[PDB]
Amino acid sequence: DLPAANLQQLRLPDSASLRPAFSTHRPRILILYGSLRTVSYSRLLAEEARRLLEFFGAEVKVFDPSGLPLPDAAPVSHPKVQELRELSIWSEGQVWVSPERHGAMTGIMKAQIDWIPLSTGSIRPTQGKTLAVMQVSGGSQSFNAVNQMRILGRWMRMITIPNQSSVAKAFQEFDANGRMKPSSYYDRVVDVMEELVKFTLLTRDCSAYLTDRYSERKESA
Amino acid sequence: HDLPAANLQQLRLPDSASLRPAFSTHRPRILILYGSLRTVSYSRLLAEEARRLLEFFGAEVKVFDPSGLPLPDAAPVSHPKVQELRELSIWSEGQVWVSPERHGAMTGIMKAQIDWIPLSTGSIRPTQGKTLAVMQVSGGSQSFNAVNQMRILGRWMRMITIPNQSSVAKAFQEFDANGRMKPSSYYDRVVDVMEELVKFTLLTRDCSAYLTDRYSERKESA
Amino acid sequence: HDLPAANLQQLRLPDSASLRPAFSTHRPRILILYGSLRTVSYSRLLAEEARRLLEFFGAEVKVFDPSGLPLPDAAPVSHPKVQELRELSIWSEGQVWVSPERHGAMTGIMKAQIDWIPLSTGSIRPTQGKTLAVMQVSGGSQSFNAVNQMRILGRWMRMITIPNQSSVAKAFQEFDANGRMKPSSYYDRVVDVMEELVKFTLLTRDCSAYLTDRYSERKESAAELEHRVTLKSVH
Amino acid sequence: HDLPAANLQQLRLPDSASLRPAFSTHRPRILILYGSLRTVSYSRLLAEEARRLLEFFGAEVKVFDPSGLPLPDAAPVSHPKVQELRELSIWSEGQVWVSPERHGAMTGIMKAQIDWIPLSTGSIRPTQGKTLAVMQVSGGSQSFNAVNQMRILGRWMRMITIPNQSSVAKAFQEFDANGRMKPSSYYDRVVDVMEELVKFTLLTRDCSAYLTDRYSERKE
């Protein structure tokens, strides 16, 4: 038996709670990228992600981090901070696309997430929402940035989908018009977006049940 | 906006029907792996509390005893402990991995079990698409080094690693003389993690094949 | 056992004398960077406690204020805060990085500062071979995610990252009303880290060029010379 | 000297002379550990290339064979393969760790070997203050996951992990039929890593007791 558990708060999982009526609205995907370079492969990859997601039927919003103050260097009502926070609240899933800069995710990528709180009043800007992580680099393949982002996804309490993208030697993959050529990298991008839409459709309607936790029911009681 | 790099014959729209086939009626199958061979092992004792909770939640639970598991490539694959582990992984729909944190990392014993499990053995994918909960136990103050490592490892195994996780600090203090976890914030988190695992397993097991039906695979198949 | 893949002409037996040139006689030059712009910032307060210790150990210390630093690539490198940062990095012989743990990771402000520092600017290497101590602070229970990330980043900056480090848990509990760190195991550790950083910087600063004199670079330089001469039609 | 949290008796100013003791003459003792027991193992062949380089550079090199090593706690600290390993570690002044990347991480074999090495065994510190070079091999395209994990592990072992490291992608392409590594930028990196490890080990081995001498420990 279970002498450390409160049997009043323990609940058997309920199949019907996992299957509420399917929503019909476009899955809401926020896309963030980690560069302000004029020629930014992370931005250009974010845009390829957008085109795919839109094809699949998602409503996509891409946040431009230009003009974002450093965390705590402005009030939370700053135009770009409010935009980012409202975008996160609006989202049902997110794509984060970071350059790998000095073998890690970028300060721009992390500063965006730094500005997003786990909670504000009753609202949880990220909890339970789906996440796809992707990186790009001018050098040979690495996973340092996507590893950091996947751990970060846990801290934000997101459902980080298993598939992810790491594009090596990015300048070889994007043409003069900023479009990705057919490649194994591109096929991965398609798989990741494809998976993200499926996970978002699967989880969004029962997310409140999925985050209805024993410990929180216990503290309410 | 156009998609000149895509194979437009294999690119398909999401299908809602496919995310909701009829629910299976058999108990969710959960395999629990733990990362220590010590006689009194807090990871094993935590594994056992996980088992108890998962059973209450209606899962069929199996726990693998790693005692006698050879080092990876130190024995043939047909070694009994290897075959048993592989069979157990195949059988499972979701898993719990419970690792001590030793020298600020997951244990050699934990990693060795996962190293013995291949992504593909013939037509069978022992781990792909299955849910995963990660937990660690430590003799010292809080760290998440082991669970962070196991979470990255979950990606490499193509598992749906649930967001919640448990890290029990100074674990020796949290277990009584009967090997039972004491009531605490840590225990309530173990409840939450097991609760979450069952929900995600129920949610995903029946549409896993659709979730894992990939553009790049169809393209290569055509 | 021979070395068929090695260019024997660029191989060098490590030379003990070269690891001991005359000691420098100026104060070890330490740059401190921190990862918060909060009014009450425990990383900044920790940075200042680190400065006092370093100065007691005889270092010359400069602390960079990241306020007004543009986002990487959001301004020309001639931006006054960017020049300041790069100039301080070039000046430094060792560094301390003090990051909060925000969302379980090093902070965007911490990483943005390093993002603004190139491995190379012409012949100048702003970070290579220099010593580094990493430290973190958190509002919550202990973690090492942030110091772990910084330790890897120190490799990528080609720094000699010292084995010891500080992670202060529930940092608000450990600083008093004057912003001074209270006596504790955590403080004793900060002392050990600063003591260690100064020893490594003294040990290493004078022979850095030798430590950083690499086979593959001697091999490349030789190939490049030969190529340049050939392009000018010299037999 | 505005240091109120500090016990001013335990504080010493750094001593330049204590960083420069008479140089040792004996050859630098390096232990190599590898993370694969496969018949054809590129971490083992890489480990052997490391050995040849370090010997040329004037190190005395020992390589531990992890075969027959029991799993941790599956045998007493006295298991013969255990006695062998702790001691090779106690003998070494620096170490090379060479792990495959398996499932995007260092191997169980690599981890099990260091799990078996305590921070202390009474008064000896098999690892504290010793130098460390980390290297990985993969069958796939480049990654740093295994060397990243090993670098953090070097911190937990209190070692001086040198900045330079090796990661060899598609390692099967880089070794010929005789098990020798082919000339390449990967090989040139290996040379650099070994060269650096020898320099660091000569630099630090004599003043280690001074370097590992702490305010906190002599306060306690």
Q: Does C230 carry a binding-site annotation? A: no
**Rounded distance between C-alpha atoms, residue C99 and residue C81, angstroms:** 19
Min Cα–Cα distance to chain A from D104, Å: 9
Instruction: Report the neighbours of A using a cutoff of 3 or more CB pairs below 8 angstroms.
Output: B, C, D
CA distances from B116 to B77, B78, B127, D50 (A): 8, 11, 12, 28
Min Cα–Cα distance to chain C from B135, Å: 15
Best probe of the A interface among D147, D148, D186, by most A CBs < 10 A, is D148
Min Cα–Cα distance to chain A from B56, Å: 7
Phi/psi of residue C189, each to 5°? -65, -45
> The tokens of B172 are what?
């020796």
Contact D13 C57 (CB under 8 A): yes
**Rounded distance between C-alpha atoms, residue B101 and residue C194, angstroms:** 28
Contact of C19 with D195, CB cutoff 8 Å: no
Residue A190 burial (CB count, 10 A): 25
Residue C172 burial (CB count, 10 A): 10
Instruction: Report the neighbours of B using a cutoff of 3 or more CB pairs below 8 angstroms.
Output: A, C, D
For residue B98, give the nearest of B39, B166, B160, B157 by alpha carbon: B166
Q: Give the chain B residue whose CA is nearest to the CA of A190.
A: B215
Query: Does any CB of chain C come closer than 8 Å to the CB of residue D206?
Result: no
> The tokens of D213 are what?
């001498």
Residue D208 burial (CB count, 10 A): 17
* Contact pairs from chain B to chain C, CB under 8 Å: 19
> The tokens of A56 are what?
């699949």
CA distances from A75 to A70, B101, B132, C232 (A): 11, 40, 39, 61
What is the torsional sign of CA C153, C155, C157, C161?
positive
For residue C162, give the nearest of B5, A124, A60, D159 by alpha carbon: D159
**Rounded distance between C-alpha atoms, residue C216 and residue D191, angstroms:** 8
* CB-count exposure of residue C90 (10 Å: 0-12, 13-18, 19+): middle
- Region of residue A183 (phi > 0: left; psi between -120 and 50: alpha; otherwise: beta): beta
Contacts with A113 (C-beta within 8 Å, 6 or more apart), sequence order: A32, A96, A152, A156, C103, C108
> The tokens of A165 are what?
């993208």
In this complex, the residue of A107, A151, A154 whose CB is nearest that of residue C111 is A107
> The tokens of A51 are what?
């085109």
**Rounded distance between C-alpha atoms, residue B203 and residue C157, angstroms:** 45
For residue B181, give the nearest of A100, A1, C4 by alpha carbon: A1
Best probe of the D interface among A105, A133, A140, A148, by most D CBs < 10 A, is A140
Q: Output DSSP code: residue A166.
A: E
Query: Does any CB of chain D come closer than 8 Å to the CB of residue C219?
Result: yes
Contact of C165 with D156, CB cutoff 8 Å: no
**Rounded distance between C-alpha atoms, residue A160 and residue A148, angstroms:** 12
CA distances from A64 to A34, A35, A59, A131 (A): 10, 10, 16, 18
> The tokens of B119 are what?
């992504």
Phi/psi of residue B105, each to 5°? -150, 170
Which residues of chain C does A36 touch, with a Cβ-Cβ cutoff of 8 Å?
71-74
CA distances from D214 to C98, C150, C196, D1, D219 (A): 21, 23, 8, 18, 8
DSSP letters, A97-125, are EEE-BTTB--HHHHHHHHTS-S-BTTB-S
Which residues of chain B does D115 touch, with a Cβ-Cβ cutoff of 8 Å?
102-103, 107-109
Best probe of the B interface among A25, A126, A190, A207, by most B CBs < 10 A, is A190
**Rounded distance between C-alpha atoms, residue A131 and residue A157, angstroms:** 10
**Rounded distance between C-alpha atoms, residue C193 and residue C211, angstroms:** 23
Could you give the 3-state DSSP secondary structure of residue A151?
helix
Which residues of chain B does D39 touch, with a Cβ-Cβ cutoff of 8 Å?
73
In this complex, the residue of C56, C152, C216 whose CB is nearest that of residue D192 is C216
Domain assignment present for residue D4? The answer is no
Domain assignment present for residue D218? The answer is yes
Which residues of chain A does D141 touch, with a Cβ-Cβ cutoff of 8 Å?
140-141, 168
Contact of C201 with C30, CB cutoff 8 Å: yes
Sole residue written with tokens 């430290």: C135
Min Cα–Cα distance to chain D from C79, Å: 31
In this complex, the residue of B56, B184, B196 whose CB is nearest that of residue A10 is B56
**Rounded distance between C-alpha atoms, residue B133 and residue D104, angstroms:** 18
Question: Quick one: chain A helix, strand, coil %, rounded to 5?
Answer: 40, 15, 45
Q: Give the chain C residue whose CA is nearest to the CA of B148.
A: C145
Contact of B110 with B99, CB cutoff 8 Å: yes
Residue A151 burial (CB count, 10 A): 22
Contacts of the segment B149-154: beta carbons below 8 A, 24+ positions apart: B149/B105, B149/B106, B149/D105, B149/D149, B150/B97, B150/B99, B150/B106, B150/B110, B151/A150, B151/A151, B151/A154, B152/A147, B152/A150, B152/A151, B152/D104, B152/D105, B152/D145, B153/B106, B153/B111, B153/B114, B153/D103, B153/D104, B153/D105, B154/A162
Amino acid type, C58: G
SS (H, E, C) A27-40: CEEEEEECCCCCCC
Sole residue written with tokens 């299976």: B24
Query: Does any CB of chain B come closer than 8 Å to the CB of residue D114?
Result: yes
Reported as type and span, the H/E element at residue A61 is: strand A59-62
> The tokens of C42 are what?
């425990």
**Rounded distance between C-alpha atoms, residue C137 and residue A94, angstroms:** 28
Query: Does any CB of chain B come closer than 8 Å to the CB of residue A174?
Result: no
SS (H, E, C) chain C: CCCCCCCHHHCCCCCHHHHCCCCCCCCCEEEEEECCCCCCCHHHHHHHHHHHHHHHCCCEEEECCCCCCCCCCCCCCCCHHHHHHHHHHHHCCEEEEEEECECCECCHHHHHHHHCCCCCECCECCCCCCEEEEEEECCCCCCCHHHHHHHHHHHHCCCEECCCCEEECCHHHCECCCCCECCCHHHHHHHHHHHHHHHHHHHHHHHHHHHCCCHHHHHHHHHHHHHHHHHCCCC
Contact of C66 with C109, CB cutoff 8 Å: yes
**Rounded distance between C-alpha atoms, residue A127 and residue B169, angstroms:** 25
Max Cα separation, chain D? 66
Query: Does any CB of chain A come closer than 8 Å to the CB of residue C38?
Result: yes
Q: What was the structure determination method?
A: X-ray
Contact B144 C145 (CB under 8 A): yes
Domain that holds residue B212: 15-222
Mode of pairing for the β-strands spanning B105-106 and B94-102: antiparallel
**Rounded distance between C-alpha atoms, residue A145 and residue A133, angstroms:** 9
What is the torsional sign of CA C74, C75, C76, C82?
negative
Domain assignment present for residue B5? The answer is no
Query: Does any CB of chain C come closer than 8 Å to the CB of residue A113?
Result: yes
Residue B221 burial (CB count, 10 A): 8
Query: Does any CB of chain A come closer than 8 Å to the CB of residue D173?
Result: no
Domain assignment present for residue B200? The answer is yes
Contact of B201 with B94, CB cutoff 8 Å: yes
Which residues of chain A does D144 touch, with a Cβ-Cβ cutoff of 8 Å?
103, 142-144
> The tokens of D129 are what?
């203050």
Contact of C136 with C166, CB cutoff 8 Å: yes
**Rounded distance between C-alpha atoms, residue A2 and residue B53, angstroms:** 8
Phi/psi of residue D175, each to 5°? -125, 135
Domain assignment present for residue D3? The answer is no
Q: Output DSSP code: residue A170.
A: G
> The tokens of C146 are what?
């942030």
Contacts of the segment C5-12: beta carbons below 8 A, 24+ positions apart: C5/D180, C5/D181, C5/D182, C5/D183, C5/D184, C5/D187, C6/D53, C6/D187, C6/D191, C7/C215, C7/C219, C9/C222, C10/C215, C10/C218, C10/C219, C10/C222, C11/C215, C11/D56, C11/D191, C12/C213, C12/C215, C12/C218, C12/D195
How distant is the alpha carbon of residue B93 from its chain centre? 9
Q: Alpha-carbon Rg of chain C, whole angstroms?
A: 21
SS (H, E, C) chain B: CCCCCCCCCCCCCCCHHHHCCCCCCCCCEEEEEECCCCCCCHHHHHHHHHHHHHHHCCCEEEECCCCCCCCCCCCCCCCHHHHHHHHHHHHCCEEEEEEEEECCEECHHHHHHHHCCCCCECCECCCCCCEEEEEEECCCCCCCHHHHHHHHHHHHCCCEECCCCEEECCHHHCECCCCCECCCHHHHHHHHHHHHHHHHHHHHCCCHHHHCCCHHHHHHHC
For residue C149, give the nearest of A177, B145, D188 by alpha carbon: B145
Domain assignment present for residue B9? The answer is no
Which residues of chain D does B149 touch, with a Cβ-Cβ cutoff of 8 Å?
105, 149
CATH of the domain at C177: 3.40.50.360
Contact of A6 with B184, CB cutoff 8 Å: no
* CB-count exposure of residue B37 (10 Å: 0-12, 13-18, 19+): buried
CA distances from A210 to A90, A95, B208, D215 (A): 19, 21, 18, 50
Phi/psi of residue D36, each to 5°? -140, 140
Contact A214 B192 (CB under 8 A): yes
Residue C39 burial (CB count, 10 A): 7
**Rounded distance between C-alpha atoms, residue D89 and residue B34, angstroms:** 28
Q: Does C43 carry a binding-site annotation? A: yes
> The tokens of C26 are what?
């100026």
Instruction: Report the neighbours of C using a cutoff of 3 or more CB pairs below 8 angstroms.
Output: A, B, D
Residue C29 bridge partners (DSSP): C60
Q: Does C167 carry a binding-site annotation? A: no
Could you give the 3-state DSSP secondary structure of residue A193?
helix
Query: Does any CB of chain D come closer than 8 Å to the CB of residue A141?
Result: yes
* Contact pairs from chain A to chain C, CB under 8 Å: 99
* Contact pairs from chain A to chain B, CB under 8 Å: 140
Best probe of the A interface among C36, C149, C157, by most A CBs < 10 A, is C149
Contact D200 C182 (CB under 8 A): no
**Rounded distance between C-alpha atoms, residue C146 and residue C58, angstroms:** 28
Query: Does any CB of chain B come closer than 8 Å to the CB of residue D112?
Result: yes
Amino acid type, D199: K
Contact C14 D200 (CB under 8 A): no
CA distances from A73 to C98, D28, D76 (A): 18, 52, 57
How distant is the alpha carbon of residue B5 from its chain centre? 35
Residue A180 bridge partners (DSSP): A174
For residue D30, give the nearest of D207, D176, D198, D209 by alpha carbon: D198
**Rounded distance between C-alpha atoms, residue B152 and residue B25, angstroms:** 32
Reported as type and span, the H/E element at residue D203 is: helix D185-204
Contact of B166 with B99, CB cutoff 8 Å: no
Contact of D186 with D174, CB cutoff 8 Å: yes
Residue A60 bridge partners (DSSP): A29
* CB-count exposure of residue D97 (10 Å: 0-12, 13-18, 19+): buried
**Rounded distance between C-alpha atoms, residue D12 and residue C191, angstroms:** 11
> The tokens of C87 are what?
């100039």
Q: Give the chain B residue whose CA is nearest to the CA of D106.
A: B111
Min Cα–Cα distance to chain B from D73, Å: 6
Residue A30 bridge partners (DSSP): A61, A94
Residue A118 burial (CB count, 10 A): 12
Sole residue written with tokens 């030969």: C226
Domain assignment present for residue D178? The answer is yes
**Which B residues 2-31 touch D at CB under 8 Å?**
none
Sole residue written with tokens 């039972």: B180
> The tokens of C161 are what?
């990252």
Q: Output DSSP code: residue D124.
A: B
Domain assignment present for residue A9? The answer is no
Contact B142 C143 (CB under 8 A): yes
The count of structural domains within chain D is 1
Min Cα–Cα distance to chain A from B114, Å: 17
**Rounded distance between C-alpha atoms, residue A103 and residue A97, angstroms:** 14
Which residues of chain B does A179 touch, with a Cβ-Cβ cutoff of 8 Å?
4-5
